[PDB]
Design a binder for these strands. Sequence first.
RNA 1: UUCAUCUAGACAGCCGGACGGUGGCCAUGGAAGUCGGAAUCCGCUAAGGAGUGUGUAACAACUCACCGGCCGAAUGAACUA
RNA 2: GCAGUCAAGCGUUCAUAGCGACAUUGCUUUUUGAUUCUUCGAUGUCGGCUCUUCCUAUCAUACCGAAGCAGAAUUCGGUAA
Lengths: 37, 50, 147, 199, 188, 68, 227, 67
Amino acid sequence: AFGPKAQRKRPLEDLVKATNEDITKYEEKQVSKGQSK
Amino acid sequence: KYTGEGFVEKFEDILKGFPNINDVHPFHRDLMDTLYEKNHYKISLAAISR
Amino acid sequence: XXXXXXXXXXXXXXXXXXXXXXXXXXXXXXXXXXXXXXXATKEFKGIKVTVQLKIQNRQAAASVVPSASSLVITALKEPKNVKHSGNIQLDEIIXXXXXXXXXXXXXXXXXXXXXXXXXXXXXXXXXXXXXXXXXXXXXXXXXXXXX
Amino acid sequence: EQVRQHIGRLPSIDPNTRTLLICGYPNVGKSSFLRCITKSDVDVQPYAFTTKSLYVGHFDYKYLRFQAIDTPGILDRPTEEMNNIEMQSIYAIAHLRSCVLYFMDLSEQCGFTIEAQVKLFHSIKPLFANKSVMVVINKTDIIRPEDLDEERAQLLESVKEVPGVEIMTSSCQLEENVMEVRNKACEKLLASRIENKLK
Amino acid sequence: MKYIQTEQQIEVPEGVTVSIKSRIVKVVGPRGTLTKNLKHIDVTFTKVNNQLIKVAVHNGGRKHVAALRTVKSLVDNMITGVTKGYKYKMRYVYAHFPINVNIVEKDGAKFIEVRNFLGDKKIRNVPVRDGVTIEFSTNVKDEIVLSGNSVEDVSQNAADLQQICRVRNKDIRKFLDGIYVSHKGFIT
Amino acid sequence: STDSIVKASNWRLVEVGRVVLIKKGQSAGKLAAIVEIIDQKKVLIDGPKAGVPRQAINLGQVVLTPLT
Amino acid sequence: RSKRSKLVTLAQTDKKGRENKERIFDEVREALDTYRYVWVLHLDDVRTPVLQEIRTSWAGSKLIMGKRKVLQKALGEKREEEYKENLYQLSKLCSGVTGLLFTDEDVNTVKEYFKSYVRSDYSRPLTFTIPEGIVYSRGGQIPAEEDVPMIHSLEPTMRNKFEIPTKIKAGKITIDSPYLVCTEGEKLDVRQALILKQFGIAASEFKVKVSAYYDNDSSTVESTNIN
Amino acid sequence: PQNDYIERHIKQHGKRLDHEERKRKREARESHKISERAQKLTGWKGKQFAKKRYAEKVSMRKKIKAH
RNA sequence: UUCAUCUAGACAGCCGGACGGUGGCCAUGGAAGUCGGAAUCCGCUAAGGAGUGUGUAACAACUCACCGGCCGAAUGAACUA
RNA sequence: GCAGUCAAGCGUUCAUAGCGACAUUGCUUUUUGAUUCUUCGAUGUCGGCUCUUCCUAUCAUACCGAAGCAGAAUUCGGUAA
Ligand SMILES: Nc1nc2c(ncn2[C@@H]2O[C@H](COP(=O)(O)OP(=O)(O)OP(=O)(O)O)[C@@H](O)[C@H]2O)c(=O)[nH]1
Ligand SMILES: [Mg+2]
């Protein structure tokens, strides 16, 4: 998965609508008494 | 108890330090997706929390 | 003038590769070096390995393939792991194919040269169901008929 | 342990800050462009895949802070699966909301021809919606792009058909045109930030 | 295993003369004179003829015979110090700060003074031993040459000068500064 | 003046034919000759002229003389 | 205790032993009555395709090499013990690295061949100065615009083993003073030959020399002097 | 910072002058220091050293059994 | 203590060679003896592994394991107490 | 801890009458850092004000060592009370 070995090498237009939807979610998100042994 | 806390204080140094890949930013999440493989990242840290 | 030398491997369709560093230092050719490469691999599959050597002098075209390599055993076939592990009839076909490569192989006769091209077949099916190592330990054909 | 030793060495970028992306083919000059535009130790060796990670350098135009993010350079061929070295570019183009400098070589010395350059620009083109692309031709010092033939210059006319683009000539030996590239990279991006400020 | 006797041989060339009373060794020849005290090693020297001298240990264990090879190795270095002499050349590579190296004479003691090592204000003095003459290399950039008759005066005075410039509390893979010994060669 | 003044360090050394004096024992003050060395400490001596019998002996009981 | 710890490995190849010596003891005595000519050849430095040229060019010849004292064991060093007669004089001559040749074509062709056969190997001749700039792996042979800068891994090898002063500015390797490694008419040092080895300069020619001949039916020792 | 930076600094500057002398003179001494730690380390430092030294002889003899 | 190697040249170390089919199949942005999975066969040889290490983006380059040149006495491994 | 597995050794001579270091596999409440808000019968008396001294198994300060140790900070490790 990662390291000196690193055997994995691989995991357009459909990536546009997703990451533009992923960002707009992100700005929407930001905007002992009585106990004893 | 003192050894028992000794393992946890090392484990509390791991789970606090690593950058919590969900809800960082969808860019920093997604460089780490390609480079660090989100599945192996989230499983190994959840193994230590177990 | 002069007489230098270059080489090239892989590919199957016209391209410039690994030689883009050399063509930057030497004479420049993009469309000319692609067609000089395509003339070498003309009617050759792009999936297979193909090794060439290119010699130029002020924009020349060069194409030759020495075929001492596994180019021989890859030639007599019809096309995670693209299996080159195939069964081919070596017995008389690789016997004549050993005649072309044995220009020096530094071997005495074809009897000590046909078995040198047999180990290169570390994939194919050869003749019969088995054309490998002890399946061609001896060679009771050609031999002296190539000398 | 091994993801801890690699995560410290990642460059420090902010997505909300004004950046600029320098994207194109390998062995073009986008590393040498980065070395002359800003102070950064990026190797300029003449082979294809030198940069395997995003390299960042900082410069200053009109009393501000700009950062220039380098790309590894990409080959699109199946468009769905791609190398992890090359996949780092695509999210640097997708997420980072700032101008992108489409860095094209109209010359000899690359691994690809001119015809492979224009076909890729229409493939990446859906990523180029909200980003105000600038196109810059490198290596004009040795070819002088009026050398170019009439039909393959009509491919450069096909570059100018996506609505907001613009072509400039540049080199990497004379240091005044490498300055004039980034000024249109800065002034066009200020059209996008100020219009987003007035809302 | 109680060897009855072992021996080694010292090859005396034509230039030098060796005077050995009980364990006091004097080597006199072309370039100069040297002495070395050997009262601790308990051996026996014997001259045969003017160019060859045999050392000897009678009835000794394993430790007492291993210390007999090294007495050959000390007198042979006393021989090559007088015929040929020694010369260590040192290069002092810096990363950013130009290292200023000088020779100063305070009170007739002739120190070696190093300044501006990795931007430090500290002045380091390395004392020069007796019989080692330091010269700065002509027309070769950044080089200091140490040379003298004795091995152990020269090799110690070159080893002292590189320990005085050790980088502390930093990473040695990054910071390149220091003084080092190029190679250990003869004069002629 | 170009010579090596290296000392010789003269030693009485045991060998075949070294004549010796017997300091203690039955004989006690009689000359004898070392015939054969046995090991580091034992030697085989004899003096028939004085009267000591032919015998092995230890070197602690004997003292070496310069004569040979 | 306190003994030298020998380095133990895991490689594939193993040691031969005595049983490879006694085979060459047999193959030399077998080749005497089989072939007709005995040619002994002094060849100190060799290259392997040079040797693989001579083997495949001559089918009738058998080029048998081995240790010297095994060749004295098989041909018979003393006159009293020998396989075939009049053989002890020619085995006296093989003092260097020698390999016997067993041909049957001609005595004129063999003595003509090795003067006609000449190759080029390392010098172990012409002088070379290095420019005071960026050094290249060809080293001023071809023009430096087409040359390749030297790999920096062997640059500590240059500063220590080759004694050449190299201080390194950036990804290339630089010297500041011009440095000449050899002069003509001088016997080259082993440090001087290794500079020409890393530079790839095999500009000194190589030829193999032969010293003696024997003929079995005539049974007499023949000495021929060509270099 | 600014991805891997030491290995670029190795290429364009070199390790050190005497980096190949000192490292080679480490394992020349490590044959003498393994026998030095086994005679020093009084009290549980001679226990865990002997447990790890004996775990190395077992791990090396398995590789010789492999071929 | 048993097993070995040797004065007909051992062990140590300098010196020389350490090759051809070959940049073996797949893998790939590139992997040429060495990021890797499966492998692993022949030629010529005194000897030279589809190859122990250094590392170039690949290559080159060096190394040992294998043999040979010098020098001339023993030496190595495994254990036992 | 129990139950296996692998095998340098041990067992009057000894593989297989029988032991077994060094390794390793069995789950011991859910593979995606959500939480577990569970304190489960200490049957027994020392604690603290004042004050002195002693060990090292060192938390700090002295000096070294090693690590992706660029610095900054921070860890492992040694000598030292
Ligand atoms: N003639 C000419 N050559 C150039 C110019 N700019 C860069 N180059 C060449 O580009 C070579 C180096 O390649 P890089 O600058 O790294 O281009 P790149 O590989 O695509 O950049 P990276 O992918 O980031 O490594 C240099 O050797 C130059 O010869 C230019 O303006 N004119
Ligand atoms: Mg480049």
